[PDB]
Amino acid sequence: PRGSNPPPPETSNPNKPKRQTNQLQYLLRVVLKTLWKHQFAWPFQQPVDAVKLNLPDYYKIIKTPMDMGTIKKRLENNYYWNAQECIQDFNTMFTNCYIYNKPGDDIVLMAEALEKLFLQKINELPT
Ligand SMILES: CCN1C(=O)c2cccc3c(S(=O)(=O)Nc4ccc(F)cc4)ccc1c23
């Protein structure tokens, strides 16, 4: 079907306030990098292509989409003011998965595994 995909979430906004913190550096260098390499990362590495993946209802249900490709670019582009803004985006990505899909679905098992690893890495966030 199509129809169409929305514009992806922004990864640049020159008027948005931003900072480099060592916590944001750790989010890129440790948290994002480890999740990124994982065997379950691939469905979360770019925005949902609702056309290709045959998920025509995706953007009827999910109105705040987020993915690790967007987060990666936001970190590389120094988009954030603090770590919480970034952790927010990971939480949105996970939440969207759990909202759209059913417990026990293969995609949800992936999200749960990534989220478990995420929380472990988040646990060692530096001062
Ligand atoms: C994480 C974004 N996302 C979904 O919420 C979702 C639902 C259904 C399929 C699918 C896909 S898929 O069409 O590539 N199929 C897929 C099914 C189960 C998996 F464990 C991984 C991918 C990619 C990313 C997705 C989804």
Side-chain angles (χ1 to χ4, degrees):
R2 44 162 16 272
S4 220
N5 289 309
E10 73 182 13
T11 62
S12 262
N13 185 335
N15 280 315
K16 188 189 169 299
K18 45 202 61 102
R19 301 197 287 207
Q20 289 197 49
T21 74
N22 69 312
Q23 286 181 339
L24 283 163
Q25 285 167 0
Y26 176 92
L27 278 156
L28 180 45
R29 292 193 252 163
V30 177
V31 182
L32 186 282
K33 299 313 184 155
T34 67
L35 294 194
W36 191 265
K37 305 155 192 276
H38 199 281
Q39 71 159 302
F40 291 166
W42 65 265
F44 305 90
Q45 283 174 340
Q46 55 286 311
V48 167
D49 188 337
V51 179
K52 182 180 170 179
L53 304 180
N54 234 8
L55 304 174
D57 57 347
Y58 190 80
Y59 295 112
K60 309 303 196 202
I61 294 156
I62 302 302
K63 305 303 200 189
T64 308
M66 183 55 60
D67 64 278
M68 297 206 303
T70 299
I71 294 166
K72 185 167 184 287
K73 290 199 174 170
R74 285 179 178 193
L75 290 160
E76 293 169 345
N77 296 354
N78 311 288
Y79 178 88
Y80 298 113
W81 180 258
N82 60 25
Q84 199 49 44
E85 284 179 354
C86 179
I87 292 156
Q88 227 153 259
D89 288 342
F90 280 100
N91 294 344
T92 296
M93 172 188 81
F94 294 126
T95 295
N96 290 341
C97 192
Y98 305 140
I99 289 163
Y100 180 74
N101 300 289
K102 293 171 199 314
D105 283 352
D106 274 346
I107 194 65
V108 168
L109 300 180
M110 292 205 181
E112 285 172 341
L114 288 179
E115 183 179 18
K116 175 169 171 174
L117 184 57
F118 174 72
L119 295 177
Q120 186 187 105
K121 297 293 129 175
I122 248 58
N123 191 243
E124 292 311 317
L125 194 72
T127 69

